[PDB]
Write a protein that binds this ligand. Sequence first.
Ligand code: SF4
Ligand code: SF4
Ligand code: SF4
Lengths: 52, 49, 52, 373, 177, 170, 176, 301
Amino acid sequence: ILGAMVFFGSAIGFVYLIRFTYAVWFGQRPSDLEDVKDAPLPLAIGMGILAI
Amino acid sequence: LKMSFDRLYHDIWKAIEELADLARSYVYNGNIQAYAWYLAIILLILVAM
Amino acid sequence: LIIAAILYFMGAGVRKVPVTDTYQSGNPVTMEYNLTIRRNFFLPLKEAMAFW
Amino acid sequence: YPIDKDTYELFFGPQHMATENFSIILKMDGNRVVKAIANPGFLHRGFEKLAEYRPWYTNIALLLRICVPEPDVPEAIYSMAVDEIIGWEVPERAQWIRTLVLEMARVTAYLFWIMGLSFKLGVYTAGQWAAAYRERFMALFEQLTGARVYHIYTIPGGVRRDIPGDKWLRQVRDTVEYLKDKLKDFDNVLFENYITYKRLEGIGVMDKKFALEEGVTGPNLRATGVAYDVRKSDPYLLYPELDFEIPVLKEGDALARVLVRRYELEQDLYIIEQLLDMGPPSGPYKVQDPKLKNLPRFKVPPGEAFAHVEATKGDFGAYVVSDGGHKPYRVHIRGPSIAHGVRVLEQLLVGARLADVPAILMSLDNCPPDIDR
Amino acid sequence: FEPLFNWARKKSLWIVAFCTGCGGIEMPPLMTARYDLERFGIMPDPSPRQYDLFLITGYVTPKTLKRIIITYEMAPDPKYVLAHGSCPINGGIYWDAYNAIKQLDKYIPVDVYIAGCMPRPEAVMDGIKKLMEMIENGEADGWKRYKENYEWYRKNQDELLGEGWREKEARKWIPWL
Amino acid sequence: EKGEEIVKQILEKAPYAEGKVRRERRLEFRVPADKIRDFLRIMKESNFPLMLQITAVDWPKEGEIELVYHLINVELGTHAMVKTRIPRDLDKARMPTVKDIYPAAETYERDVHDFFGVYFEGNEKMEMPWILDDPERGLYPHRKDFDMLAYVKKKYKILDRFDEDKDKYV
Amino acid sequence: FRIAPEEKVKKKPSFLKPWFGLKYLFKKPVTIKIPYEFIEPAPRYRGFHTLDWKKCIGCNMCGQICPARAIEMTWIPHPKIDYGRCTFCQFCVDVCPTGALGFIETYMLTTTWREEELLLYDWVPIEPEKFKEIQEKFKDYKFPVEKIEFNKETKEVTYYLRDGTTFKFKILGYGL
Amino acid sequence: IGVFLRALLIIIYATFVGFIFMGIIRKVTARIHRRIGPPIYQPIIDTLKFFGKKENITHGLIYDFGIIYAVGATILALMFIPLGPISVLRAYGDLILVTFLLEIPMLGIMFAAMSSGNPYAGIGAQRALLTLLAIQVPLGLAIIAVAEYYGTFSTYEIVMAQQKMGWSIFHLPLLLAAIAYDIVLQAMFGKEPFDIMIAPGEISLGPMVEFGGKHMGMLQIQHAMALFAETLFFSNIFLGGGVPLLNTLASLAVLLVKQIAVLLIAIFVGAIFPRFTIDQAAKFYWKWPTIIAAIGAIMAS
Ligand code: SF4
Ligand code: SF4
Ligand code: SF4
C-alpha cells in the first residue's frame, strides 16, 4: 500500500519538471527579454560545482 | 449515496452475461473449418507435449 | 547515443528555420500571437480531483 | 510582443482533418474554451452572382455543389421550385423516381456522416465500414444516372434517365435487406460502447428555448424537445403513403443529437424498403413535350417560389425569383449550416474541453460548403 | 546510394488530408475499405512535414490559397502536388467566380492533372500509377521547379493577392479579439 | 384554408399587413420598411418562432433591395415571407437589426451586409471579417452595380491556359 | 404526430460488446486490387464526347446550355469541347438536335505538367469509330488521343491515336 | 569487443523485428475493418523514406538532442531485458530500471517536441503527460505484485524461477497484475483506447505534429523500440521465455511468438474502442485497474 504512493510520487515528480521546462524555457520569447544577458560567473561557479 | 453497490453487481453480471453472448458467437460458429482449426490447434498442443 | 547519432548525423540538409513561422493548423501566425500555452497547464488534472 | 499573455489561440484551420474546411478560432484557456468565434468562407464559390448568368435548365449542374455529402438534395429542391413557378404536371413515375433517389441520397449522407464522425472520434473501424457500405450505394447510383456523386439527374421537369429495370430494382432490395441486417454491427462499435457514451455525455448542452429560435432546423433540434419534421408536417414527394415514425427526445446534450440520427437511419432504410414494394407504375420520365424545346430560350412567367426539403443536417430552402426571361433573377440556396454550427456553435463551445471540439463539430453535421453560398 | 531511396519513395507516399471543400466526398472513400490506397502504402496523416503527396482536391479560394501555399512551403524535399478534378485545369465551372482561382499552374507547381467532376477513384488510381511511373526515373517535377524558378511564381503570387499575407492575414484578428 | 384563418388572426393585430395566401401554406405579405421592427415580434409571439435566411433580392429598375424575411411555423408547417422595400444607395442602405427578438438574425445579417449594401445599426458583429476578405470587402459583389467578367479580368489577366476566347457568354 | 419512442431509441452502454465488431478478422476483405483487377463501369456512364462530323450543323444550340462555357465553336463549323472547364453534366447531349454529340464511358485521362501534354485538353471530338478504341484496342477505358501536336501558323492538329489514323485537319478561325 | 558486436546484434535485430511488428499491427488493423492494407514490410519503407529528404527544420539546439536522447533511452531499455539467452548482461535487469526506462522515451519524444513551440505540441504534451501521471498508479502495483511474489529483482533470477516451476500468468495474485499490465500497455504503447499521446485526428498529431524528415525517422525507430521493449518486458516477466544454435534460435522464436501474443490482444482492443478524453483517462486509471492491481498487491502479501 505504501509502494504505490511513492511510485506515483516518482511519476508526479516527473510531471511538474516537464511543466517547469516548458513555459520558462521553450516556445517563443516575448519582446521584453531582448534586453537580457548571459549568466554571471559567481552563480556559474556554484552551478559547475554542483554539476561536477 | 451516489456510490451504491446495487449498481456495481448489476454491472458485473451484465458483463458476464454479455460475455456469455460473446463466447456463444466466437467459439461456436457455423464455419466447419473453424472447428477443423480448433482440432489442429489442440493437436499442435499435443505436439508441444 | 553514439548509435543514435550515427542514424542522425548524416547531413542531407539540416537548414534552420525561425519559430514564428510554424504549423498553426496550416495558417499564418505572426509575432503577436500567444501560441505557447502558459495558463495553468493542467486544467483536466485540476478538474479530475476537484473534490480533493 | 505577444499581446494576450493569458489565452493561447490555437485554431483548427483547414488542414486539420477534424474540421473539414472552416476555421474556428478558439481563445483557449488552458484546456477549456472561453470564446469560440468561427471564420467560415474558405470555400466561397459564390452562387448568388454566379448562378444568375446561366439559363434555367442548365442551372442544375452548377447548383449541385452547394452541398457535397448529399448530391441529390440540392438539385431536388431547385427542381421542386421551378416546378412551381411554371406549374408542370410531373407524373407519378417521375415523382416516384425523385422520391427514391431523394431517400437513397439521404441514407448515403447518413453513412457519410457516420464515416466523418468516426474519422475524428478515433475509432477507424466504424469509419471504414461506413465508407465501404456507402460505396455500394454509390455503385448502385452509377447504374441509374451517371457518376458517383454530383449526378445531374433531376431537371426542372421530371428526371433525365429512367430505371434500367429488374436488374436494378431487385438490386436495391438486395442492398437494403443487406444493410438492414448489417446495421446491428454499427451499434456495437459506435453506439453501445462505454467509451463513446462516456465521451459525449453532457457536452454541449443545448436548451429547449435555445434551438427553435436560434436557426436550427435539422434533426439535431429534434433531439431537444421540438416536434417538427418537414417530411411529416408538409409532405412534398411520395411521402404521405409511407407512414414512418419520427424520433423526438427531451434531452439535448451531444449524444442525444447522435442517437436521433441513428434512429433516423433505421427508419429511413425502412422507408426505402417500404417504398420499393410499392413499385412504380407506368408513365413518362419527362413532363411535357411542347413546352420544353429550344432548351436555352425557356421563358418562364414571372413570380417567385420557395421550397424546402429535409436533409441530413438541416431543412434548407431555396429561393428562386423569375424576372420573366431565361435567367433566374436570383436563386438563393439557403445553406442548412448557416446558423447551425456557426452561431449556435459559438454558445456551444464555451466551457467545453478541447477533446470535444471536433466531436461537437460533427454532432451537428457541419458541412462547410453551406455557410458560404 | 540513389536507387536505395528511389524505390523507397514510391511505396510510402504519405498524403496530407486537406479535403479541399467540394471533393472531400471522393477523397475519403478513395482511402477506405473499398477501392483503396493503403495497399499502395498511401497512409494519410495531417501534418505539413510528414507528407509528400498533396491533393489539391478541386477549386482553390484565395482564402485557401494562402493556407495551401503555407502548407506547401513546409514539406522539405519530395513535395509534389497532384491536381485533381477539373478546377485546377483552366478553372472548373467556376470560371465566372471572382474567388475561385483559375489556372493553378501559375501559382504552385502542379505535377499531374486528372480529369473528372468528380473524378472517379479509378481515375485517381490511374493518376497515382502514372505518378509512380513518373517518379521511377525521376522527371524534373515540382519541388525542382519551385526552387530554381522561384522568381516567376513569387511574382505571380504577389500580383494576385500579395502584399505580404503574413501581415494581412495576421493583423486581421488582433483588433477583433 | 387554415392559413387564411391564421392570416386573418394576424391582420387583427396589425393594420399594414396585406396578406396573400398562396397554395396552402406559403403565407406571403409585404409591410412598409421601417415598420417591421415593431411587427416581427407580433409574428414571433403568435406562432412563428423559427427564422430562416434573410434573403434580399435586388432591382436596378426601381432602386430597392427588397429584403424578404423567411419565417416558418412549427405547429402547422407554414412559411411566411414578410418583405420590405428599402432604398438602394449606400447612404440610404439602412435597416434596423432584429437581434432583440430573433437570435437567428445574428449571422444572417452578417452575410447580407458583407455581400451587398445594407447596414444594420444596433449590432456588434458588423466590421468583422465574416467572409470575403480584402480586397473583396471593399466593393459589394452581389448587387447589380458589380458585373462579372470585367472585375475577373482585372483580377486575373487570362482565363484560358488554352486557346482562343473562352471568357465571354452565350 | 406519430412520435416513435418514449425511451425506445436510447440504448444502454456496454463494456465488452465492441468485440462483435471483431468478427471480420477471418472473412474475405472487401477490396478491389486495381492493378490489375478491372471494375467494368456502367453501360451509360457519363464520359467523353464522340461528335459525328456528318450530322453536325453548327447551330450552336449546345453553346448556350453548357453550364461551364466550354463548347466553343471552330471552323472546319464544329465545336471543340475542352475539359478544362467541363463538368460532364451531358446537357450538350440531349439538347443537340441532330444527335451528333454522344457520350461514351471513358473517364481515365492523366496528363503531366508540361504544356505539350496539356494541349491534350482541346480536342475536336472524333467520330464514333473511337468506340473501336474502347473495344478492340486493349480495353483500358482511357482517352484515345494521347498526344496533340498543335503548330503555329500551320494550324494542323494531329490526334495521334493509339495505333490508328493521325486524323489531320486544319483549324482556322473561332467563334461565329 | 565481443559484447559490442553482440549489442549491435541485439539493436539491429530489434530494429528488423520491431518495424515488422509495427507492420503487423498495421496489417491486423487493416484486416480488422475489411481491407488488405499495407504489405508486411511497410514501416521499413517509412523509415527509408524519411532519411531521404533534402531539407530539415531544427528549430533549436535542444530540438535535436531530445529525440536523440529518446532513441538512446529506448535502446538502453531493451539492452537489459533478457532477449532469450543472448543477453549482453543478465546480472542487473531490475524491474524499476526497465519500468522507468520506458517512460524516458515519453520524455525525449516530448522534450524535443516542446522546443518547436506550438499550441498543438503544447496541448499534445499536455495530454501526453497526464497519461504518464495516471498510468504509474496501476503500473507500480503490478511491479510490487511481481516483486513480493518472487522476491528477487535481477531479471535472470525471475525467468530462472519461471522455467524452474510454473507459468506466471497463472497463480491469481500474479494474474491480477497482468490484467493491470494488459490495460496499461495500450497507454504505454500509444494504441487506440488510451491513444492520446499520439491522437491522430482530434488534435493534429499532438507531440509529433511538426517534426520533419529525419526526426520522424528517429521517432519511428524509437516507437518500434518502445513497442519491442515494453512487449519483451511483459513477456520476460509475466510469460518467461528462457529457452547449441538450434535451441537458441527456437528459444528466440517462441519468445517472438509470445511477443506477438500480447501484441495480438493489444490490437483487438485497440481498434473497436474510440479515443479517450484525457480528463477521463486520468479518472479511469484510478478506478478499475488500480483496485484490480491493489487486490493483487494485497494477495501477493
Ligand atoms: S473539378 Fe468539378 S467537382 Fe471538383 S471542385 Fe471543380 S467543379 Fe467541383
Ligand atoms: S460536357 Fe457538360 S459541361 Fe461540358 S459542354 Fe457538354 S453539357 Fe456543357
Ligand atoms: S452538336 Fe448540336 S448544337 Fe453542337 S454544333 Fe452540332 S448540331 Fe449544333
